Every structure is written in structure tokens, then in C-alpha cells.
Design a protein around this ligand. Structure first.
Ligand code: ADP
Length: 241
């Protein structure tokens, strides 16, 4: 929940207003910016908070396995079924094959799963949250994302700022992560960051955002290993000698 940058606080405000709706929300942001945490917040601030919160990463599964995991087969209940009365979070949405996109639109618009065999369709009641860092309108133009799915899925859009655009939050979060690492390795006090360390942290572009910042800071505190003088060496790249 860390951050004071205006851009982040505006996201939290937006989320508070979107959460009670049953409308789909699209979250745009880089890796490590907190997208799944925001999806979770949408669920727990909604009327569905006692229902299930289910997640699925679309990039992780090949096309036939993604189809079965999302819509079910035979049985093997899919993630829409498991999310009935709750919220389903679809991460890396732009990697979904076009077959899955069309089937997703069908579920959104008709509210049921189709299914094979003698079974009747399964009606489902699921609040959808999706995330990506792709330019979805650009993909629509290329024919790699369905325009009709976007016209429907993007009821509203939450844009999470990358850490490099929340420059004020870098030192706040670095200090928080450093202190927790000091507890983990039993140092009595975090001895601070030198100006060199601060320059290194603030100049780096953080392609992995908060996840990367946490790891870099934890590693740096461990390598420093003392409370006797301030931390000077920020180890961004551990693959260097
Ligand atoms: N506002 C925040 N304050 C503190 N930690 C955060 C914040 N946002 C994200 N994190 C942390 O950064 C890491 C990445 O968060 P996550 O929600 O998985 O990002 P994404 O889903 O975009 O990859 C997690 O360890 C999470 O706890």
C-alpha cells in the first residue's frame, strides 16, 4: 500500500469508485506495478468481497489449455465457474489467442458458458478485471485484438504509473524495503542511503518496478551487512562481478 505520489493516490481514488460496480475494469501497467494487488482491491471493496477471487495468467498457457482452464471442459470446471459470485482477474490479456478473445466476449455478453455433450449451458455471474501493458487500440488496428471485445471490456481503465514516474516513491519504498531486510538479517538499524546510492536508485529506470526495487534493495542491504555506516553500493545487476 506504499506510495504518496499523486498519480498513485489518484489510482486508489479511482479504484474506490469502480469497485462497487459489476462492470469490467481494464488495468494498464508494466510488470511489478501492482496490477494484481489493484485487482484484489477492486474485489474486496466491492459487494462481492465474500465471493471468490480467482486469477488466471493468459500468457502462461498454450491455446488449448487456456481454453479449457478458462471455460472448462467435459468435469474440469474452468476459472469462470470457480469465480461465480465473485471476481475473475485475467492477467496478460493481450496474449490471449483470438479464439479465446471471441469466446470471452460471448461469455461477457450472454452470461453463460457453452457446453459440449448433453449438458445445458452454465450461467455465470462474474465481475471481470483484466490487465496488460500492451497498446490494445494498436493491436486492434493490427487485427491481433478484437475490436468488439475491447469496445465492451474497457468500461473503464486504470493506468498504473511505473516507478520511474513516481520518482518521489522510489526512496520511500527503498527505505521501507531496506528496513524490513534489516529485520530479516538482524541488523539493529538501517544506516541510511548515501547520496551515491540515492543517485543510483533514482536514475535507474526500474523495468521491473516495485518487485525489482524490493529485490535490489534486499540484496544491497545483505551485501552491505552492517549498521556501522550507510549503504553506498546499490547492486542493480547481480550478474556482474
Ligand atoms: N503500492 C505498493 N506498496 C508496496 N508494495 C507494492 C505496491 N505495489 C506493488 N507492490 C509489490 O510489488 C510486487 C509486485 O506487485 P504485483 O501486484 O504482483 O505487480 P504486477 O501484478 O503488476 O506484476 C509485489 O511484491 C507487491 O507486494
Amino acid at each position: 500500500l506504499l506510495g504518496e505520489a499523486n498519480s498513485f493516490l489518484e489510482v486508489l481514488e479511482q479504484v474506490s469508485h469502480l469497485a462497487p460496480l459489476d462492470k469490467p475494469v481494464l488495468i494498464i501497467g508494466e510488470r511489478g506495478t501492482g496490477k494484481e494487488l489493484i485487482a484484489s482491491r477492486l474485489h474486496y471493496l466491492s459487494s462481492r468481497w465474500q465471493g471468490p477471487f480467482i486469477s488466471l495468467n493468459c500468457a502462461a498457457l498454450n491455446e488449448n489449455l487456456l481454453d479449457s482452464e478458462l471455460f472448462g471442459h467435459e468435469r474440469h470446471p474452468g476459472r469462470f465457474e470457480r469465480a461465480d459470485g465473485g471476481t475473475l482477474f485475467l492477467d496478460q490479456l493481450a496474449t490471449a489467442p483470438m479464439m479465446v478473445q471471441e469466446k470471452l466476449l460471448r461469455v461477457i455478453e450472454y452470461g453463460e458458458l457453452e457446453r459440449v455433450g448433453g449438458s445445458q449451458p452454465l450461467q455465470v455471474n462474474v465481475r471481470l478485471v483484466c490487465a496488460t501493458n500492451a497498446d490494445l487500440p494498436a493491436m486492434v488496428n493490427e487485427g491481433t485484438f478484437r475490436a468488439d471485445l475491447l469496445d465492451r471490456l474497457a468500461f473503464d481503465v486504470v493506468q498504473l504509473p511505473p516507478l520511474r514516474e513516481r520518482e518521489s516513491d522510489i526512496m520511500l519504498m527503498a527505505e521501507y524495503f531496506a528496513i524490513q531486510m534489516c529485520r530479516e538479517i538482524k541488523l539493529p538499524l538501517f544506516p541510511g542511503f548515501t547520496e551515491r546510492a540515492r543517485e543510483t536508485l533514482l536514475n535507474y529506470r526500474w523495468p521491473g518496478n516495485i518487485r525489482e526495487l524490493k529485490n535490489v534493495v534486499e540484496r544491497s542491504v545483505y551485501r552491505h551487512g552492517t549498521s556501522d555506516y550507510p549503504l553506498d553500493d546499490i547492486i542493480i545487476d547481480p550478474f556482474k562481478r
